Amino acid sequence: DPMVSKGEELFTGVVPILVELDGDVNGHKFSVSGEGEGDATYGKLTLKFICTTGKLPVPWPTLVTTFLMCFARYPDHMKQHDFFKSAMPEGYVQERTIFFKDDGNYKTRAEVKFEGDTLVNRIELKGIDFKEDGNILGHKLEYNYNSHNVYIMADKQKNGIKVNFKIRHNIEDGSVQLADHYQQNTPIGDGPVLLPDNHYLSYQSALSKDPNEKRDHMVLLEFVTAAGIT
């Protein structure tokens, strides 16, 4: 497939990644810089984020989904389903609203694209209507993360895709904070892009700390594989 080729070809090896986030949650302002690499052949991403403004005002787990679906491993049998890569290198806009149950919401807009050999994820985040002393602004979420399917469909009208999924964040009391994700991706460019049949990505994420790092930070390791189209 000569089309499913240019984009796909960009991910056959290890790709350097840069992530930049400008954040405002209930007027609490913050910036985050991320670096690492992705290897889509194995669905593997390795990232370190730093809050460059000081103390992050929300729990780092809450920002995992916001901080690279073009790095998912698509089985050869599902390569016609890979919207993310087919939009490269001109890239794609990923927008979300993330509804925290009985709390506030994030609204995000990201541009994901190549700048030379680096894959870059530039994000603006706004959060509103949070409780001061809720699970999020009041930092009650454990520093861990659960494995979750992510559901993908065509939005044949924005010439893009819609994505929905729920994240349950473990709270320090043994309970869970739900984060209900609604997502839309559209290509930046005018060229043909793959519009997939319904399928899902399986995600697993592992959070850690750099023992040598004194700034407020998160180390994230993610594995992601496309499925649900046997």
Short mmCIF file of N, CA, C and O in Angstrom, two decimals, residues 64-139:
data_model
loop_
_atom_site.label_atom_id
_atom_site.label_comp_id
_atom_site.label_asym_id
_atom_site.label_seq_id
_atom_site.Cartn_x
_atom_site.Cartn_y
_atom_site.Cartn_z
N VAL A 64 -1.16 12.08 32.38
CA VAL A 64 -0.57 10.96 31.59
C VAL A 64 -1.23 10.93 30.20
O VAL A 64 -0.50 10.97 29.19
N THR A 65 -2.55 10.93 30.20
CA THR A 65 -3.22 10.78 28.88
C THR A 65 -2.91 11.98 27.98
O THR A 65 -2.92 11.87 26.74
N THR A 66 -2.72 13.14 28.60
CA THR A 66 -2.50 14.39 27.84
C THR A 66 -1.10 14.36 27.27
O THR A 66 -0.85 14.66 26.11
N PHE A 67 -0.13 13.98 28.11
CA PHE A 67 1.22 13.94 27.57
C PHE A 67 1.48 12.80 26.58
O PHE A 67 2.14 13.01 25.55
N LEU A 68 0.34 10.35 22.55
CA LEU A 68 1.32 10.08 21.45
C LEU A 68 0.91 8.77 20.73
O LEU A 68 1.66 7.80 20.63
N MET A 69 -0.33 8.76 20.24
CA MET A 69 -0.94 7.53 19.69
C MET A 69 -0.37 7.00 18.39
O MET A 69 -0.51 5.79 18.11
N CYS A 70 0.37 7.90 17.71
CA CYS A 70 1.17 7.53 16.53
C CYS A 70 2.24 6.51 16.93
O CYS A 70 2.83 5.90 16.07
N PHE A 71 2.52 6.37 18.23
CA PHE A 71 3.52 5.34 18.63
C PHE A 71 2.93 3.93 18.95
O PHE A 71 3.64 3.05 19.41
N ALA A 72 1.64 3.73 18.73
CA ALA A 72 0.99 2.47 19.04
C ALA A 72 1.54 1.42 18.05
O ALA A 72 1.73 1.70 16.84
N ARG A 73 1.75 0.20 18.56
CA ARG A 73 2.00 -0.93 17.63
C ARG A 73 0.65 -1.38 16.91
O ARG A 73 -0.27 -1.92 17.53
N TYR A 74 0.58 -1.12 15.62
CA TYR A 74 -0.52 -1.69 14.82
C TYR A 74 -0.07 -3.01 14.20
O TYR A 74 0.92 -2.99 13.45
N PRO A 75 -0.77 -4.13 14.56
CA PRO A 75 -0.50 -5.42 13.84
C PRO A 75 -0.48 -5.21 12.32
O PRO A 75 -1.28 -4.39 11.77
N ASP A 76 0.43 -5.91 11.62
CA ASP A 76 0.38 -5.86 10.14
C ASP A 76 -1.05 -6.01 9.64
O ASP A 76 -1.42 -5.33 8.72
N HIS A 77 -1.85 -6.88 10.25
CA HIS A 77 -3.22 -7.13 9.77
C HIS A 77 -4.19 -5.94 9.95
O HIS A 77 -5.27 -5.93 9.36
N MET A 78 -3.78 -4.93 10.71
CA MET A 78 -4.62 -3.76 11.02
C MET A 78 -4.02 -2.45 10.54
O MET A 78 -4.52 -1.38 10.90
N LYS A 79 -2.96 -2.51 9.72
CA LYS A 79 -2.25 -1.29 9.29
C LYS A 79 -3.09 -0.27 8.50
O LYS A 79 -2.82 0.92 8.56
N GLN A 80 -4.17 -0.73 7.87
CA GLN A 80 -5.14 0.14 7.23
C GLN A 80 -5.97 0.96 8.22
O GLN A 80 -6.71 1.88 7.82
N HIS A 81 -5.85 0.60 9.51
CA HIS A 81 -6.63 1.24 10.61
C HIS A 81 -5.90 2.36 11.36
O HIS A 81 -6.48 2.98 12.24
N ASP A 82 -4.64 2.57 11.00
CA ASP A 82 -3.73 3.49 11.71
C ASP A 82 -3.81 4.97 11.16
O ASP A 82 -2.97 5.43 10.34
N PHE A 83 -4.79 5.69 11.70
CA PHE A 83 -5.04 7.09 11.37
C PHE A 83 -3.79 7.95 11.72
O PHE A 83 -3.39 8.87 10.97
N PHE A 84 -3.27 7.69 12.93
CA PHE A 84 -2.21 8.48 13.55
C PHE A 84 -1.00 8.64 12.72
O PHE A 84 -0.57 9.80 12.49
N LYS A 85 -0.46 7.51 12.22
CA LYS A 85 0.70 7.53 11.37
C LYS A 85 0.36 8.10 10.01
O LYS A 85 1.17 8.80 9.43
N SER A 86 -0.83 7.81 9.52
CA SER A 86 -1.20 8.21 8.10
C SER A 86 -1.27 9.72 7.97
O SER A 86 -1.15 10.26 6.85
N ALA A 87 -1.46 10.40 9.10
CA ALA A 87 -1.47 11.87 9.14
C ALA A 87 -0.07 12.55 9.17
O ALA A 87 0.03 13.76 9.15
N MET A 88 1.00 11.76 9.22
CA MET A 88 2.36 12.25 9.37
C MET A 88 3.06 12.30 7.96
O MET A 88 2.70 11.53 7.03
N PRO A 89 4.03 13.20 7.82
CA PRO A 89 4.51 14.08 8.89
C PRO A 89 3.80 15.40 9.20
O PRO A 89 4.23 16.10 10.18
N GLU A 90 2.81 15.82 8.41
CA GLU A 90 2.14 17.14 8.67
C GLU A 90 1.43 17.11 10.01
O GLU A 90 1.26 18.16 10.63
N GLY A 91 0.96 15.94 10.43
CA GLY A 91 0.51 15.75 11.80
C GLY A 91 -0.96 15.91 12.01
O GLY A 91 -1.77 16.01 11.03
N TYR A 92 -1.37 15.95 13.28
CA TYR A 92 -2.76 15.93 13.63
C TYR A 92 -2.99 16.75 14.92
O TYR A 92 -2.05 16.92 15.72
N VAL A 93 -4.17 17.33 15.04
CA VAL A 93 -4.67 18.01 16.24
C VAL A 93 -5.40 16.94 17.11
O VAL A 93 -6.24 16.19 16.61
N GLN A 94 -5.08 16.83 18.41
CA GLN A 94 -5.81 15.96 19.31
C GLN A 94 -6.40 16.89 20.33
O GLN A 94 -5.65 17.64 20.98
N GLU A 95 -7.73 16.88 20.46
CA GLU A 95 -8.48 17.71 21.41
C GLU A 95 -9.21 16.74 22.36
O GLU A 95 -9.73 15.62 21.96
N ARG A 96 -9.31 17.14 23.62
CA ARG A 96 -10.07 16.42 24.56
C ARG A 96 -10.82 17.28 25.53
O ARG A 96 -10.38 18.43 25.83
N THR A 97 -11.83 16.65 26.12
CA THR A 97 -12.39 17.10 27.40
C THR A 97 -12.29 15.90 28.30
O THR A 97 -12.54 14.76 27.88
N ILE A 98 -11.83 16.13 29.52
CA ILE A 98 -11.65 15.07 30.51
C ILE A 98 -12.47 15.45 31.72
O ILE A 98 -12.19 16.48 32.33
N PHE A 99 -13.50 14.67 32.01
CA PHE A 99 -14.51 15.01 33.03
C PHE A 99 -14.07 14.21 34.24
O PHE A 99 -14.17 12.99 34.27
N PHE A 100 -13.56 14.90 35.23
CA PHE A 100 -13.32 14.20 36.50
C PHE A 100 -14.63 14.08 37.34
O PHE A 100 -15.24 15.10 37.72
N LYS A 101 -15.10 12.84 37.52
CA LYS A 101 -16.31 12.57 38.33
C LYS A 101 -16.42 13.35 39.63
O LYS A 101 -15.54 13.26 40.52
N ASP A 102 -17.54 14.03 39.77
CA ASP A 102 -17.77 14.87 40.94
C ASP A 102 -16.69 15.91 41.18
O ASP A 102 -16.48 16.34 42.34
N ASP A 103 -16.03 16.35 40.09
CA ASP A 103 -15.02 17.37 40.15
C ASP A 103 -14.99 18.13 38.81
O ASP A 103 -16.03 18.13 38.00
N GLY A 104 -13.91 18.85 38.60
CA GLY A 104 -13.60 19.71 37.48
C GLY A 104 -13.31 18.99 36.18
O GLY A 104 -13.36 17.74 36.08
N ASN A 105 -13.01 19.78 35.15
CA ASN A 105 -12.75 19.19 33.85
C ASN A 105 -11.50 19.81 33.26
O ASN A 105 -11.22 21.00 33.51
N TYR A 106 -10.72 19.00 32.56
CA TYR A 106 -9.70 19.55 31.66
C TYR A 106 -10.21 19.62 30.23
O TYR A 106 -10.92 18.71 29.80
N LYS A 107 -9.76 20.64 29.49
CA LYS A 107 -9.99 20.78 28.04
C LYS A 107 -8.57 21.00 27.48
O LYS A 107 -7.83 21.88 27.98
N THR A 108 -8.20 20.20 26.47
CA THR A 108 -6.87 20.19 25.92
C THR A 108 -6.92 20.30 24.42
O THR A 108 -7.86 19.81 23.79
N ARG A 109 -5.88 20.92 23.88
CA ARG A 109 -5.64 21.02 22.46
C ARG A 109 -4.14 20.82 22.28
O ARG A 109 -3.33 21.53 22.84
N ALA A 110 -3.82 19.83 21.48
CA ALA A 110 -2.48 19.43 21.15
C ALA A 110 -2.25 19.43 19.66
O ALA A 110 -3.21 19.12 18.92
N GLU A 111 -1.03 19.77 19.25
CA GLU A 111 -0.59 19.55 17.86
C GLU A 111 0.52 18.54 17.91
O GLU A 111 1.53 18.76 18.62
N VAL A 112 0.36 17.46 17.17
CA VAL A 112 1.35 16.43 17.16
C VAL A 112 1.93 16.35 15.74
O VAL A 112 1.20 15.99 14.79
N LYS A 113 3.23 16.57 15.64
CA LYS A 113 3.86 16.58 14.35
C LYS A 113 5.37 16.48 14.37
O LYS A 113 6.00 16.68 15.42
N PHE A 114 5.96 16.22 13.19
CA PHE A 114 7.42 16.18 13.09
C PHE A 114 8.00 17.58 13.00
O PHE A 114 7.53 18.45 12.29
N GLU A 115 9.08 17.82 13.74
CA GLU A 115 9.92 19.02 13.50
C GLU A 115 11.30 18.44 13.25
O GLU A 115 11.98 18.01 14.23
N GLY A 116 11.71 18.32 11.97
CA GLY A 116 12.91 17.52 11.60
C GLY A 116 12.71 16.05 12.00
O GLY A 116 11.67 15.48 11.72
N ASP A 117 13.70 15.44 12.68
CA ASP A 117 13.58 14.01 13.03
C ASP A 117 12.83 13.76 14.34
O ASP A 117 12.51 12.61 14.64
N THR A 118 12.50 14.86 15.04
CA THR A 118 11.79 14.79 16.33
C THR A 118 10.26 14.85 16.24
O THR A 118 9.68 15.72 15.57
N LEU A 119 9.60 13.94 16.94
CA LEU A 119 8.13 13.99 16.99
C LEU A 119 7.71 14.88 18.16
O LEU A 119 8.14 14.64 19.29
N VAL A 120 6.95 15.91 17.89
CA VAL A 120 6.68 16.94 18.91
C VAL A 120 5.16 17.00 19.22
O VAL A 120 4.30 16.99 18.35
N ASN A 121 4.89 17.18 20.53
CA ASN A 121 3.54 17.18 21.06
C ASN A 121 3.41 18.49 21.82
O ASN A 121 3.97 18.62 22.88
N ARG A 122 2.72 19.47 21.24
CA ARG A 122 2.57 20.79 21.85
C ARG A 122 1.15 20.93 22.37
O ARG A 122 0.19 20.87 21.55
N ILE A 123 1.01 21.19 23.66
CA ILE A 123 -0.29 21.11 24.33
C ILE A 123 -0.64 22.38 25.11
O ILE A 123 0.25 22.98 25.76
N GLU A 124 -1.89 22.76 25.05
CA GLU A 124 -2.47 23.83 25.87
C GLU A 124 -3.53 23.09 26.68
O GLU A 124 -4.39 22.36 26.09
N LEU A 125 -3.51 23.30 28.00
CA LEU A 125 -4.50 22.66 28.86
C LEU A 125 -5.25 23.69 29.64
O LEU A 125 -4.60 24.53 30.29
N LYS A 126 -6.59 23.63 29.70
CA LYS A 126 -7.29 24.53 30.66
C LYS A 126 -8.13 23.67 31.57
O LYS A 126 -8.81 22.76 31.07
N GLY A 127 -8.05 23.90 32.88
CA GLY A 127 -8.93 23.18 33.85
C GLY A 127 -9.77 24.17 34.59
O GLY A 127 -9.25 25.23 35.02
N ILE A 128 -11.05 23.83 34.77
CA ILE A 128 -11.97 24.71 35.46
C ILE A 128 -12.93 23.89 36.34
O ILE A 128 -13.20 22.67 36.07
N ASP A 129 -13.47 24.59 37.36
CA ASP A 129 -14.49 24.05 38.20
C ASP A 129 -13.99 22.97 39.12
O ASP A 129 -14.76 22.15 39.67
N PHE A 130 -12.69 23.00 39.39
CA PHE A 130 -12.15 22.05 40.38
C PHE A 130 -12.47 22.48 41.79
O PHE A 130 -12.53 23.67 42.04
N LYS A 131 -12.69 21.50 42.69
CA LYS A 131 -12.69 21.72 44.14
C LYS A 131 -11.24 21.93 44.65
O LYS A 131 -10.40 21.08 44.46
N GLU A 132 -10.99 23.09 45.24
CA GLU A 132 -9.81 23.38 46.10
C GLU A 132 -9.11 22.26 46.83
O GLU A 132 -7.88 22.18 46.83
N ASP A 133 -9.90 21.52 47.59
CA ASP A 133 -9.44 20.42 48.38
C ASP A 133 -10.06 19.12 47.85
O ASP A 133 -10.28 18.19 48.61
N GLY A 134 -10.37 19.04 46.54
CA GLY A 134 -10.76 17.71 45.95
C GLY A 134 -9.58 16.77 45.69
O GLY A 134 -8.44 17.08 46.10
N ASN A 135 -9.84 15.64 45.03
CA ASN A 135 -8.79 14.63 44.73
C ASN A 135 -7.65 15.18 43.86
O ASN A 135 -6.51 14.70 43.96
N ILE A 136 -7.95 16.22 43.09
CA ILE A 136 -7.01 16.71 42.09
C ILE A 136 -6.19 17.89 42.67
O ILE A 136 -5.00 17.73 42.88
N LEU A 137 -6.85 19.04 42.91
CA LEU A 137 -6.17 20.22 43.51
C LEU A 137 -5.64 19.91 44.91
O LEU A 137 -4.64 20.48 45.33
N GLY A 138 -6.30 18.97 45.60
CA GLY A 138 -5.86 18.54 46.94
C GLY A 138 -4.92 17.34 46.97
O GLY A 138 -4.70 16.76 48.04
N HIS A 139 -4.39 16.95 45.80
CA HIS A 139 -3.39 15.87 45.64
C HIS A 139 -3.69 14.58 46.42
O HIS A 139 -2.89 14.10 47.27
#
